[PDB]
Ligand binder design. Structure first.
Ligand code: SF4
Ligand SMILES: [Zn+2]
Ligand SMILES: [Zn+2]
Lengths: 434, 444, 419
């Protein structure tokens, strides 16, 4: 581990515990998902993006300038975590494309982190040769570089470093006659340098991921890594943390106002459907019941609420008892865990059991068409421009970010200060707004 | 007081009960550490040079261990018996054709003569199973986990009937050399735990063995485990005031200091019943740090089981009570016609493995990959040591002579230990020339 | 690519083992709801006729065209009347009978103590006349004798039971292993339904039934957005607690947490013995606490290496140790169920979990990183956490850490994964 950035082409050969193995896998999955969501929400170059992702790195300790702390733990964490993601992600072309997008975002940000003094030794450590030119050479060949340069306006050849490269390394660059050539050597600004290195890095990663895809069947024989490595990205929440066992004071009568002021669109419309129908299908019923369990409602409050609502449902109260009260108590109590003991996370809500005719569960952004999304947004009184970028985000299949933007719009705020993954987190933050 | 009061009032103190070999005098002694004494572990990639690695089992590679052992034994017996070709267990042929597979019990209890099944290797019979019938078979001797070559008639496919069985030829004896003939006569101490009574910590039998050794001056001494057994009531109730490793180190240092004057070589065989050590058969040796240079030159530790050579004579050491384990479910057509001990030793020599029984009894813990790569007999041993809770005995079968040293302590009742002369006889002449001379089983 | 068939409703259970309403599109867009399914077969004939009737009712209700909620409500109500009828004894006695054949003679079975039908054969051959020969079918029923024996050790004959008023039948044993498996085999895969929930539906079982209940099929990575890595209180909730009698007073001591109490008095359990009258701190007896730890982790290692195998078809649940040489796609085929897959009773990772649970019990250093309020951390550590007691706790840690270091791929090597 000689430098912070590193190109990942030498797999580690150390020995680590299972707990550290899972910690690295989950931490790097969280980092890449955060990179995806932040890059979707913001522009890739803004200081807000830079500082927010720096804070994400600091809370996940994945990169920093060399010191006593950096040498042992963080860069090694980066190494093994990246390779276990290689194993997780080499399954499919779609996952490979996703991983490549996020790792290019990560590597470009990290390169922007590195100060200009250390980029020379980084390229030297990169094992592929590139020679920076001297100031005298730059001054002598400035006119040639400007004359042969791309549409960059003016003669200004600023502080940006210029390197010497074999011509075969920049084929697509020079083949447009937008660079000067000297004895088979090119001279290039920093933006095109990083473009070249990222293209080469994507080529090497594509080949390596294909090779690991050829190596998956042998390495999947293990039983303690199959159920994880099948689903690091597909169906794992990034520490949603809205686990059962929370506390709070909720008044049963206030449920309507709390639904219209603090519920994510899916749960809001589910509660309205319950109020207007006094009956739900299995999926929506279980979803809303365990959500109400999560928000802090106690067992007696939940039972009384559901019984009262089925009073308007017109079935026998003893039938209610025998049929459902067992199910609600089981959800609040004993095992059957991870399906009835837990509050549903957003990634689960979107990927599991899409609603059908007569169903109202499921995230509406992913499970209903844009015209009905627009109708619902009009019914919820959001500005037409806000609805416009909501639909733009829906076209970009970033449903969680769309829900985020809906949250700031309904709360009349700018940034929620997080990235939502759990409806109970949505509700907790809305209560934090008071 | 009343702890070990039998050992303070044992009439048979020093008396010898049984003997094998030649009528020999009683002044049993050795030349001390002086003289050329060889001591080398042998066979099956060197019986855990390192400590050990794992407790993670994979059912697939356990299966490949099983089928590999079955295939190896099948190939060896096919080449030795000039067999035409084996047949799949599910392929019915009317003419008597040979089969192959390891013996198992149909249910989960103790083996019964009519509750036995046959399951073969996958390359012959897809690893399937089939019940066997022994009513037609005249003589046999079966126990779970042994390879057999049953040329039974299977005209139906769903059940075979035994016609005649093939005994398994044992491994050839380890071929000696001239330097082996260049050894003079030597005698060995053997002793197995427990070294204290059921209600003591004093280790009076241990002191008695120290006295016996420093009075007799033997060549090499053998001490089997357990040293601090878990089944002891004083430890199972766990009233001890000192750590298990502390007590164990105290014990080892007591034996070491008690045999400084002996000069005889020393080695300890760990046992599954030992509490502080890893309960995984086969086991790594013990762990100890405080040794001087002469201590290292005089004391060793070996894995359990171990195949070690002394003066070019093969010693096969196993601590587990394999005799008792086999005797529980081994079956034969006749019981009183031959010796149960004789047939059990027949099986242990035949199956080429230090533990031929599968599945083992509850009070063991076998990791099968390590068992296959570390617990195979390299050769038919010259002499075997099997400390067993059953009665002490010494027999010789198929050239291999076996001594049961007995238990040094049976609760509070008197125990036994054994002495054996070994000496390489004339290099040629008779085809079989056992290094052993004579053995005494002498009560402690 | 092409279409091969239509199923109006399908119960996905296993490869070539499912229930599915076959739909053959007829003329004018109509279809016939043909009834076909794979894998419903049963291997052992030792079920009550009322149990078979209940299973047929379950399959009929799960194969009706109506909605999931309607089917669930019908099955739950019917299961409730079945449970109440069995509990109050209104069910006629003849339906409780169990039939079973005899492969061998009664004494020949090595598991005579565990097989109730061979036990009944022993009883009849002893007390009566005509012996039970191999190839004959024994008829018997379970009974409750008040002798706290195992159910298998209490099976009687129907006529003998009807002639005996002293001892009665065991509704608990039926609701445990004669009705619950038959229904649960089909009704369990339906989402939002678990064997614990059926137990609550049918009777007073839940607690003792989770005690005597298999939690192997419950695990499945089909959670499409559920767990990430869990927390301790649900990781170790299946791990057995730590036992130790107090040398001073002979009182049992319970430990499943580094600390003990609620809030201000959240002192470690080792500070005070569970006995209120005991005045000696367990902190003195670190030697024999470590000895007990060595002993019971030794017992757990022995239990795992025992290599006990269980058939995962809930009806069979064959308990055996001989790993069969036959081996299917998923694992070792059941020698009794020619279509099944075995797996250990005590998982290797289950033992890993329990040993990590022990190191969690004794890892005061990590437990000091979970209470957020640093002021409380400081006052508690100054009032009780001396360096001597921390060294004792660290010794307790190492007592299990020196097994965990060599423990069964609790560490993973990267070379064979990246080769
Ligand atoms: S993103 Fe999650 S919380 Fe928001 S509406 Fe969709 S499922 Fe609900
Ligand atoms: Zn006490
Ligand atoms: Zn089965």
């Amino acid at each position: 581990y000689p430098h912070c950035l590193q190109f990942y082409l030498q797999p580690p050969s150390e020995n680590i515990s299972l707990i550290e193995f899972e910690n690295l896998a989950i931490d790097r999955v969280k980092l890449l998902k955060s990179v995806e969501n932040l890059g979707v929400s913001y522009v890739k170059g803004t200081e807000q993006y830079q500082s927010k992702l720096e804070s994400e790195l600091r809370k996940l300790k994945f990169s920093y300038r060399e010191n006593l702390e950096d040498e042992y733990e963080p860069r090694r964490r980066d190494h093994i975590s990246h390779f276990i993601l290689r194993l997780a992600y080499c399954q499919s072309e779609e996952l490979r494309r996703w991983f490549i997008q996020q790792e290019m975002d990560l590597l470009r940000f990290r390169f922007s982190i590195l100060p200009k003094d250390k980029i020379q030794d980084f390229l030297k450590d990169s094992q592929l040769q590139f020679e920076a030119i001297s100031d005298e050479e730059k001054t002598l060949r400035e006119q040639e570089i400007v004359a042969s340069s791309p549409s960059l306006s003016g003669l200004k050849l600023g502080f940006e470093s210029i390197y010497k490269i074999p011509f075969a390394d920049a084929l697509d660059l020079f083949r447009g006659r937008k660079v000067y050539l000297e004895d088979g050597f090119a001279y290039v600004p920093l933006k095109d340098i990083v473009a070249i290195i990222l293209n080469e890095f994507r080529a090497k990663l594509s080949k390596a991921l294909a090779l690991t895809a050829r190596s998956l069947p042998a390495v999947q024989s293990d039983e303690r890594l199959q159920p994880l490595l099948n689903h690091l990205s597909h169906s794992y929440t990034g520490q949603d943390y809205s686990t059962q066992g929370n506390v709070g004071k909720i008044s049963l009568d206030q449920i309507d106002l709390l639904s219209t002021k603090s519920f994510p669109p899916c749960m809001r419309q589910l509660h309205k459907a319950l109020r207007e129908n006094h009956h739900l299908r299995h999926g929506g019923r279980m979803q809303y019941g365990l959500f109400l369990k999560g928000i802090g409602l106690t067992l007696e409050q939940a039972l009384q609420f559901w019984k009262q609502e089925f009073i308007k449902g017109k079935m026998d109260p003893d039938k209610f008892d025998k049929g459902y009260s067992y199910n609600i108590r089981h959800s609040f109590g004993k095992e059957g865990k991870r399906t009835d003991y837990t509050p549903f996370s957003c990634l689960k809500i979107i990927l599991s059991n899409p609603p059908s005719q007569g169903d109202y569960h499921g995230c509406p952004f992913r499970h209903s068409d844009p015209e009905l999304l627009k109708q619902k947004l009009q019914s919820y009184k959001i500005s037409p421009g806000g609805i416009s970028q909501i639909l733009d985000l829906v076209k970009g299949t970033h449903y969680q970010v769309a829900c985020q933007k809906y949250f700031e719009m309904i709360h009349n705020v700018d940034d929620c200060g997080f990235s939502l993954n759990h409806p109970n987190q949505f509700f907790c933050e809305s209560q934090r707004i008071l | 007081a009343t702890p070990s009061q039998k050992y303070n009032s044992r009439s048979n103190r020093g008396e010898v009960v049984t003997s094998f070999g030649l009528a020999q005098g009683v002044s049993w002694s050795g030349r001390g550490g002086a003289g050329n004494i060889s001591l080398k572990v042998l066979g099956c990639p060197e019986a855990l040079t390192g400590s050990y690695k794992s407790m993670f089992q994979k059912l697939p590679d356990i299966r490949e261990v099983l089928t590999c052992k079955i295939e190896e034994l099948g190939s060896e017996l096919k080449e030795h018996y000039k067999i035409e070709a084996f047949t799949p267990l599910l392929a019915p042929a009317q003419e008597p054709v040979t089969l192959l597979g390891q013996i198992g019990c149909d249910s989960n209890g103790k083996l019964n003569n009519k509750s036995v099944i046959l399951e073969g290797d996958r390359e012959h019979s897809s690893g399937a199973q089939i019940p066997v019938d022994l009513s037609e078979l005249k003589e046999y001797s079966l126990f779970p986990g042994q390879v057999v070559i049953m040329e039974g008639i299977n005209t139906t496919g769903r059940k075979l009937v035994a016609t005649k069985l093939y005994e398994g030829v044992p491994l050839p004896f380890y071929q000696p050399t001239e330097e082996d003939a260049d050894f003079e006569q030597s005698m060995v101490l053997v002793a197995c735990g427990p070294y204290t009574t059921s209600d003591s910590i004093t280790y009076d039998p241990l002191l008695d063995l120290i006295a016996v050794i420093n009075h007799d001056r033997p060549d090499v001494c053998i001490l089997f485990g357990p040293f601090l057994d878990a089944k002891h009531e004083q430890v199972e109730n766990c009233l001890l005031t000192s750590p298990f490793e502390d007590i164990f180190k105290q014990c080892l240092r007591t034996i070491i200091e008690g045999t400084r004057s002996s000069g005889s070589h020393l080695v300890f065989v760990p046992s599954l019943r030992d509490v502080h050590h890893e309960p995984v058969y086969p086991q790594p040796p013990f762990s100890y740090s405080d040794l001087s240079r002469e201590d290292k030159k005089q004391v060793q530790f070996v894995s359990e089981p171990c195949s070690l050579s002394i003066n070019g004579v093969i010693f096969g050491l196993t601590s587990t009570d394999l005799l008792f384990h086999l005797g529980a479910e081994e079956i034969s057509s006749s019981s009183g016609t031959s010796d149960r001990f004789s047939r059990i030793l027949k099986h242990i020599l035949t199956q080429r493995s230090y533990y031929p029984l599968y599945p083992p009894q509850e009070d063991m813990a076998i990791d099968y990959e390590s068992f296959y790569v570390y617990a195979q007999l390299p050769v038919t041993p010259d002499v075997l040591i099997i400390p067993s809770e059953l009665r002490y005995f010494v027999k010789d079968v198929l050239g291999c002579v076996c001594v049961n040293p007995g238990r040094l302590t049976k609760g509070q009742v008197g125990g036994t230990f054994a002495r054996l002369y070994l000496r390489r006889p004339a290099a040629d002449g008779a085809e079989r020339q056992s290094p052993c001379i004579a053995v005494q089983v002498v009560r402690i | 690519i092409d279409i091969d068939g239509v199923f109006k409703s399908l119960l996905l259970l296993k490869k070539k083992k499912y229930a599915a309403l076959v739909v053959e599109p007829t003329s004018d867009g109509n279809y016939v709801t043909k009834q076909e399914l794979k894998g419903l077969d049963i291997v052992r004939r030792d079920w009550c006729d009322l149990a078979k009737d209940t299973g047929n009712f379950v399959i009929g209700q799960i194969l009706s065209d109506q909605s999931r909620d309607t089917i669930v409500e019908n099955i739950q109500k019917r299961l409730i009347e079945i449970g109440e009828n069995v509990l109050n004894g209104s069910v006629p006695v003849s339906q409780f009978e169990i039939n079973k054949a005899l492969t061998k003679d009664p004494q020949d079975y090595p598991d005579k103590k565990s097989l109730p039908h061979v036990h009944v054969a022993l009883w009849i051959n002893s007390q009566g006349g005509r012996k039970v020969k191999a190839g004959d079918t024994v008829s018997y029923v379970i009974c409750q004798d008040g002798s706290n024996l195992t159910a298998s050790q209490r099976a009687y004959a129907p006529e003998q039971l009807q002639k005996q008023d002293n001892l009665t039948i065991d509704t608990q044993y039926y609701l445990a292993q004669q009705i619950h498996p038959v229904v649960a085999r089909i009704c369990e895969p339906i989402d939002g339904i678990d064997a614990v929930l059926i137990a609550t539906w049918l009777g007073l079982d839940p607690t003792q039934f989770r005690v005597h209940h298999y939690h192997k099929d419950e695990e499945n990575d089909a959670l499409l957005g559920g767990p990430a890595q869990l927390t301790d209180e649900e990781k170790y909730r299946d791990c057995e607690r730590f036992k130790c009698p107090c040398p001073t007073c002979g009182t049992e001591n319970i430990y499943d947490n580094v600390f003990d109490g609620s809030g201000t008095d959240m002192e470690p359990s080792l500070y005070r013995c569970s006995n209120i009258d005991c005045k000696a701190s367990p902190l003195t007896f670190t030697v024999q606490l470590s000895n007990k730890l060595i002993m019971d982790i030794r017992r757990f290692i022995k239990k795992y290496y025992d290599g006990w195998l269980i058939c995962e078809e809930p009806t069979c649940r064959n308990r055996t140790r001989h790993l069969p040489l036959q081996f299917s796609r998923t694992g070792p085929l059941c020698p009794a169920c020619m279509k099944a897959t075995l797996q250990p009773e005590y998982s290797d990772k289950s033992l890993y979990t329990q040993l990590c649970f022990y190191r969690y019990i004794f890892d005061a250093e990590c437990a000091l990183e979970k209470l957020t309020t640093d002021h409380e951390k400081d006052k508690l550590k100054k009032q009780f956490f001396t360096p001597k007691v921390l060294q004792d706790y660290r010794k307790l840690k190492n007592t299990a850490e020196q097994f965990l270091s060599r423990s069964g791929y609790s560490e993973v090597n990267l070379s064979k994964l990246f080769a």
